[PDB]
Amino acid sequence: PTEPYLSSQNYGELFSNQIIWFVDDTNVYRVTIHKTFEGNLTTKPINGAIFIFNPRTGQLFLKIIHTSVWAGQKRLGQLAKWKTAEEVAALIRSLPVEEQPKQIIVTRKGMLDPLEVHLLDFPNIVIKGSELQLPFQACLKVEKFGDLILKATEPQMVLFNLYDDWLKTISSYTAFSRLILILRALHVNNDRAKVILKPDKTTITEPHHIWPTLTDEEWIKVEVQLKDLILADYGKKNNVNVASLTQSEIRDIILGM
Amino acid sequence: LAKRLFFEGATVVILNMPKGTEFGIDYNSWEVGPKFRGVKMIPPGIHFLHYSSVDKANPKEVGPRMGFFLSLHQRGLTVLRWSTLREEVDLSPAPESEVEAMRANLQELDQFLGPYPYATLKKWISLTNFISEATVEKLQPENRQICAFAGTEIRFSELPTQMFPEGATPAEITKHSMDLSYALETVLNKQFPSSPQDVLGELQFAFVCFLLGNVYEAFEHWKRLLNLLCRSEAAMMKHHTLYINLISILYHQLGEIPADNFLTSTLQVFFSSACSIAVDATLRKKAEKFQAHLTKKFRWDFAAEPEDCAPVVVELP
């Protein structure tokens, strides 16, 4: 029995002809700290989102998960996985046939079974996990996204494109690498990395864009810094801090081993 | 004491079994030769009889194990014969003329009969006390013999692959994929229309056929069936005594496993459902105790939610 998965050997398929979605369920069940009327600290759920992302076009489907779906429900943790799969399935159904995904890659293995069950009517879709640990969960540290989710009053599907206008000047592989670098940096530390994304006080991101408007050399500058921020976190975490192991060993770091 | 089993026990005699054959009942085994002609002092009830031929004439310490279930009676006498043609035991009924001569001879045959070791009875009962004649009659193969390696197929109840009713909406697909109670009831009503707890005998039957018959496909059925039961949360409210018995069945079954994952997950779900405030208090107190037992034994936290089920904790003002 074959058990496919995104790996370092095949990850070129992301940019190949076919249509591929990443699905991250990580941020659909979220809570915050909360004080009861009686003055005791507990948690309460806040809104979440499903991240559905096409790595070849940059296309993002951000399904906002409003807390009403939890109301009067038990074991939200388990239920979140099944809610995600319902929405991916509902999304696939609304798309015309030539737009449905050929492969769904999940960030978390708990999503394989619920997806398989809800996608039983789409027998040709590959549903598999990933050996690369891609930091898609940091998408809500992007304040445009975090705030739209936090304040949503109703379930909604909002479409974005994570590659802004890069695809006019760079390939999907380079575009993807740039996005994962930013996301991993935002995962390493939000604050240091948002600084690095504003090299200049006049550097502004467009209204319809996600990422700051930068020159070709500024982007080079920002990507060097984000690399150093990620690697300084690896060294400090794993206490094997060398510039010595980097012969495309960095490729393993940035993508997630 | 239990000396009364000399007079009141059952006796199984096997005729013309080749020297070196492996023969046994329940957890007990004997090597076969001219000085061994079966088993005496067997406690009445249902028992599992097994045997393996020699490998390839000269013993290589192997032979595919075969087995069959017998309902044995007080002062009963069973006469089994070896088939030279088939290299297996012939369960064909012995002529009652042949049986009566055999019983007239038990006094002299007693030197050649191994006493059933009473010290193993208590463990065998713990694994089979829910197996009835109805169970054996329903599950055993067409030709009644279970085999490690075609008329030998155990006749297990069909288990559903689809957990939800036909035409279910996405929300109903979700509800019935998380709570298998609808699925479990579809099996109960078809297999055991009037006595749902008969499922418990089928679960012991499967476990025995694996543990003592080395039939792997009965371990898989045991797994499927146990999964159907442990993830059927609503059902615990409905079939409450069924689940009280399942805990005791399971304590003895798992006591015979070394725990070489499928069980840790299904049992976590079971304990979540069985230990909630929702269920009958005696089920909850029993599930509580079994949980602590299982934790200490297997060094696992069956009372923990799975790690991948935690929410993101978001810092916000």
Residue numbers in the entry:
A (entry chain B): 1758 to 2014
B (entry chain A): 10 to 158, 202 to 312, 322 to 378
What does the paper say about this structure?
PRPF8 harbors two regulatory pseudo-enzyme domains at its very C-terminus, comprising an RNase H-like (RH) and a Jab1/MPN-like (JM) fold. In a previous study, we demonstrated that the human Aar2p homolog AAR2 is produced from the c20orf4 gene in HeLa cells and that it stably binds the PRPF8 RH domain in vitro. U5 snRNP assembly in yeast requires binding of the the Aar2 protein to Prp8p as a placeholder to preclude premature assembly of the SNRNP200 helicase, but the role of the human AAR2 homolog has not yet been investigated in detail.
We previously reported the crystallization of a human AAR2 variant in which an internal loop (residues 170–200) was replaced by three serine residues (AAR2Δloop) in complex with PRPF8RH. Despite the low sequence identity, the overall structure of human AAR2Δloop in the AAR2Δloop–PRPF8RH complex is very similar to that of yeast Aar2pΔloop in complex with the Prp8p RH and JM domains (Weber et al., 2013; Galej et al., 2013; root-mean-square deviation of 2.13 Å for 236 pairs from 330 AAR2 and 342 Aar2p Cα atoms). As previously observed for Aar2p, human AAR2Δloop exhibits an N-terminal domain (NTD; residues 10–158) mainly composed of β-strands, an α-helical C-terminal domain (CTD; residues 202–364) and a C-terminal, irregularly structured tail (residues 365–384). Compared with yeast Aar2p, the AAR2 CTD harbors two extended helices (α11 and α12). In addition, Ile225 and Met230 are shifted by four residues (about one helical turn) along the α5 helix compared with the equivalent residues in yeast Aar2p, giving rise to a markedly different angle with which human AAR2Δloop contacts the PRPF8 RH domain compared with yeast Aar2pΔloop in the Aar2pΔloop–Prp8pRH–Prp8pJM complex. The C-terminal tail of human AAR2Δloop in the observed conformation would not be able to concomitantly bind the PRPF8JM domain as observed in yeast.
